């Protein structure tokens, strides 16, 4: 289908619609494609799963259901007319679609139209109600009665097919069809009057049945075996978890870039048991307040640096103006987009992408000059006092940018030279 990365890149109108839906993706699009000059094909090539998510969101429809059984008219009846319900009725009933397609633009307007459609005999007839001859309905829609009957016979013709043999009761009734016994009672014949004409409950059963086979064929759209279904697994072997076990072998290697004796440890054990059974002194442990003073010096030396870190233990409040702040934010964001595309370039490992790496490296050099002239402008317009903040803030991304340049240069000298 239209599910390949090529087709997702091809659906430019869908790209247009989702771009118009988003806002920061718009701003990124003008800065890259319109301002910097990024080709669209590799703009969206980093956003293929998001394109797919939007395509799935747009390209889905709902289950069919009986609009008629659900919807009740509730004296002009009030209607909560939904265009989704209208199209539900339309592709539920092509007779209603054909009655629509020649009446709104040619004969009468839309509100008088759907007023006649609620008024009509075919409304309550195709609705879960036997049609009454007392009802006047809509005489214009009464011309569609024999057209819908033609549709009924045509749909019955296309639905009719040879029946699976074991299920088929026609084989049972035609097993001995030459039986001349006695017919059953009035009980077993269908509900008819004294004139023999039926009530039509078999007809409405046919209609709801035909609704179920329209559901079956809606499933059965573009979008031997008897032995297995007659086989019984009740007295058979259960399914075995064929899952593989895992065993471990463990040998940790030691790190890559004096010994006391048994006599020594025995005599020290002897000494420390002698001291333990000898004496414990309570107040001998108090330090001499100079070695304790150096202890305090070391502790407060730790405390000063660690609490200075703990002084700095939505984002933080900034002294930048909002225009310069957003400009450095968006330039940082698009330079991150460049560098992610550069990792796409370098980690591709293809000679095919060499001119892409070259032209993008020119774009990155332009980004470098943009950053330098940006820092120069903030320097000369602010006296460096917050341009220091701007440069320190944008420092790590340009550091990784320089890392990318040094990798490209070093690898260029490795393979070329």
């Amino acid at each position: 289908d239209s599910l390949s990365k090529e087709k997702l890149l091809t659906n430019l109108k869908l790209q247009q619609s989702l771009l118009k839906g988003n806002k920061v993706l718009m701003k990124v699009f003008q800065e890259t494609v319109i301002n910097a000059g990024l080709p669209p094909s590799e703009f969206w090539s980093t956003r293929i799963p998001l394109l797919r998510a939007f395509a799935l969101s747009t390209s889905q429809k709902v289950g069919p259901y009986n609009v008629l059984s659900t919807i009740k008219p509730v004296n002009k009846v009030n209607v909560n007319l939904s265009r989704e319900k209208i199209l539900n009725i339309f592709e539920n009933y092509p007779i209603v679609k054909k009655a629509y397609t020649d009446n709104v633009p040619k004969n009468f307007k839309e509100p008088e139209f759907w007023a006649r459609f609620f008024s009509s005999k075919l409304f309550r007839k195709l609705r879960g109600e036997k049609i009454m001859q007392n009802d006047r309905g809509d005489v214009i829609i009464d011309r569609y009665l024999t057209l819908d009957q033609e549709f009924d016979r045509k749909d019955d013709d296309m639905l009719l097919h040879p029946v699976k043999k074991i299920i088929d009761l026609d084989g049972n009734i035609q097993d001995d069809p030459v039986v001349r016994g006695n017919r059953p009672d009035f009980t077993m014949q269908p509900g008819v009057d004294i004139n023999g004409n039926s009530d039509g409950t078999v007809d409405i059963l046919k209609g709801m049945n035909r609704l179920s086979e329209k559901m079956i064929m809606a499933l059965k759209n573009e979008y031997n075996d008897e032995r297995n279904e007659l086989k019984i697994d009740d007295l058979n072997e259960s399914y075995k978890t064929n899952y593989a076990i895992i065993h471990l072998k463990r040998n940790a290697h030691e790190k890559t870039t004096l010994k006391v004796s048994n006599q020594q440890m025995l005599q020290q054990l002897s000494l420390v048991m002698d001291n333990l059974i000898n004496k414990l002194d309570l107040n001998q442990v108090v330090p001499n307040n100079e070695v304790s003073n150096k202890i305090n010096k070391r502790v407060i030396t730790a405390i000063k640096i660690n609490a200075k870190q703990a002084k700095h233990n939505l984002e933080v409040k900034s002294t930048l103006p909002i225009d310069l702040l957003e400009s450095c934010r968006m330039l940082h964001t698009t330079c991150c987009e460049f560098l992610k595309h550069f990792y796409i370039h370098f980690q591709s490992g293809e000679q095919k992408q060499a001119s892409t790496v070259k032209k993008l490296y020119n774009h990155l050099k332009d980004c470098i000059e943009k950053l330098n002239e940006l820092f120069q402008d903030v320097l000369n317009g602010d006296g460096e006092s917050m341009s220091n903040t701007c440069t320190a803030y944008l420092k790590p991304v340009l550091n990784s940018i320089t890392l990318a340049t040094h990798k490209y240069d070093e690898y260029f000298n490795e393979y070329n030279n």
């Binding site: 059984s69 029946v163 299920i167 009761l169 009734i173 077993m188 079956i216 499933l219 009740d234 007295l235």
Partner: protein
Amino acid sequence: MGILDEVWKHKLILVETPDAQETSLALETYRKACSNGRGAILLSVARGKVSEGIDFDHQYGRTVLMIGIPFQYTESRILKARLEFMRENYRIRENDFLSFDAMRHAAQCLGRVLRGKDDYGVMVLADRRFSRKRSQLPKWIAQGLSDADLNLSTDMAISNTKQFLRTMAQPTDPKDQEGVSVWSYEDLIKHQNSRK
């Protein structure tokens, strides 16, 4: 009056058509409905064509209603002559036979649920006069029937079906039936030695 119209949203419904071709296509739709899990509801006669050989199992055989006693129509001259006929010959009681024959038809209809020792269901019967028919019931059918179940109502019937579906909504130990309902060949040998 529209209760069919409002219960339309739950499942489908099929009724025994006078044409058995349409009935076969109806059975195909019901088979596909239980295949995809929508499910449908079936209506046919206790002396109808569905009642004489059609099987239902493990999603088709799940529960079957009988409403009232399935009696033959009373004012049949052939029926009354046969009733008199079998009484004068073999002393067969008329009303007792009529009840027994209705229970025979009902039991034949209600035997289309269970195939092996793995299927399950609830057997629901709706008449006041059903309570005196345990003797007319088959031995295994009335064996599962309780004397407290001889007079029940719809609310605790609904309750008991709920605790039924919670009961066998859960698995069971194989060792509880490893040699007492299902046998191995060794279990058969052990029973043979126990008998001899």
